[PDB]
Amino acid sequence: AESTLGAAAAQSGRYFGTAIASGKLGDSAYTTIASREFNMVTAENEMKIDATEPQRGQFNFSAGDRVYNWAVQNGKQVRGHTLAWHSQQPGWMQSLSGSTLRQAMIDHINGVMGHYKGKIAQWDVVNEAFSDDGSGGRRDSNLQRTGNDWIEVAFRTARAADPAAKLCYNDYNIENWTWAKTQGVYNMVRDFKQRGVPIDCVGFQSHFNSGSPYNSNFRTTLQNFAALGVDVAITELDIQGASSSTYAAVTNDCLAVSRCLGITVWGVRDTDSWRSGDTPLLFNGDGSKKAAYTAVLNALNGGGQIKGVGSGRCLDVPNASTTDGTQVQLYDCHSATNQQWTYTDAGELRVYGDKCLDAAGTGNGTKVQIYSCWGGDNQKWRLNSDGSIVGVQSGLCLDAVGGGTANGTLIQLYSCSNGSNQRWTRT
Template identity: 65%
Template sequence: MRKLWSASLVTASLIASAVLPVGTAAAVPGTTLASAAQLTGRYFGAAVQGYKLAAPAYTGILDREFDVVTPENEMKLDATEPQQGRFVFTAADRIVDHAVQQGMRVRGHTLLWHAGQPSWLVNLRGAALRQAMLDHVTQVVAHYRGKILAWDVVDEAFADGTTGARRDSNFQRTGDDWIEAAFRAARAADPGAKLCYNDYGIEDWAQAKTQAVYRMVRDFRARGVPIDCVGLQSHFDPNRPVPADFTTTLRNFAALGVDVQLTELDVVGAGATQAEDYRRAVTACLAVSGCTGITVWGVRDSDSWRSSGTPLLFDANGARKAAYTAVLDALNGGARP
């Protein structure tokens, strides 16, 4: 009699587990970075080099693991407007077309940056430069209207150091309102795209640069300037690891009513130490509901702008590293929306 009763309990337990409602938290974890991030309501993307889309070894990883792509260089000013008024979108279009075919979304990077400027723009001054700047924003954003998840409208406009000052760029010399003007032009060209300010060195809440960007975003939000998100580039290394207050930084920016995104994440290093820094960065994002996604700055170590530091989740041969496992585990342990 006892054996029959025990068997009945086992049967009942199996039946109960078989009829768990769809979407129960005990569901199957994500098996790729994108699928695991999606379970938390976030995206997981990668920076892409368009000429590598012809390589199956590259696209095999890209298409399997990521759901958002960021053109690494193809949308920058020198690439899209090499001569004033002559726009070239071929390379960027290739990336956007690939993303659409694969069901991915696109982060536009970047409209205005102090570096990577064509000579014609460098030689302009004053009102002529301001008008050329706004024309560029309008034309590029309009070309991709409806196809871009978020634009890095302005990149790296604040100086390093302890002053919290704006960078002394040619754009800055057209007037303090140049960033605001750029955001307003971008919104007019595509009301549906998220508009982001993107910078490095703003991950530590105690830094003057972080505080300066925070004050700008707070001011923009108070005055109705159309800013929707802040991109924290998140380039880490042994001399600049993930700060202890990273979650605080993300939370404080998000409290202004903007999304926060890790836009260029990479970690110089290897093995368990690198894996732990990646885990900490991802966990910080997962702790803040307003942190809507993460982009790593490349696919394989060999694709990285600092490849000698082996900073990415896949090695040069495309094999998953310990850092990959740490990120996937962190995503699968993240809170569901």
């Protein structure tokens, strides 16, 4: 298909997944979206070290299995996250050092992979082993202190435990090619491939924001690692502000690299995010598709004035007034400011620069007007490929009242029927 992210990604042999929290599976609003849109799942915390081995040698897969069962019951594949990591270690392991820690690491890998043997598509075997101090060197942790070869040992151990799973190294801030961290990871992978250390993929977490923005050279970064003979994947994607352009850009970067397996966004709704304050996901708290959602779907599927097809007239602001509450209408198209609409990354349709197409309600017949831009979901719109314009908050379509076609026809919100008075083209 091409109406859901997962199905659209499958059209190019890829997947589109999300992170699932077992504690939210009882929320039908959560699961409805999750089961429908994604075909790949990562347990947000259920498969971490502290959750799977609470006490040394005593494994517990109850939380992890709830996530796994849900995934398979709903036709999704699973990424295992994560086997060796300096963070979120259970108390007993934090107390270990030297050879004792090294063996415990090995035992943990064998224990967790044995339970899920043959059931996991990808495993983040080692997570975040590199430093952020700009040296491009290893992060200092109890694991690194057991010996520089700890990462290699983790991978060799993993391959023996379950040779059916793809083994990935996973990290953040390794997307921009110019960073020392990115290059430090590249050299490690190169070394591993030349010495025969088993590693099949590199996961780029892809947590983008103002302090660590997406950069177009990310595509060369992906190509460079791919050239080493490993697959690559975007594993924990989220973008501060959820810019439609940036979300579409990241998607196209993966689509340009044959070795890019797929994309996983780190969560379902903004409110489920570990960084909810940054509204970095594709669905808002209400479970509504955001503007970025449409941008991603359109990219996966291959992808001024606004005139209605059924009337041939343009979206117009009466008498070119700038008064809040002025309802918009259809009118003879002519290059005039009151007919110039700018679609922003946030999904707004701006006029006069600071006025926004505004929905004064969420029900059928709601008046569509202009109002000072402030960022509300009632000022957010999704421009579907079928030519329809849907309001993020209401889920309703821009509709020319009564199918009218003459000048003065008013614009409202109405159930989407894909009628001709609901289709628009940008010129």
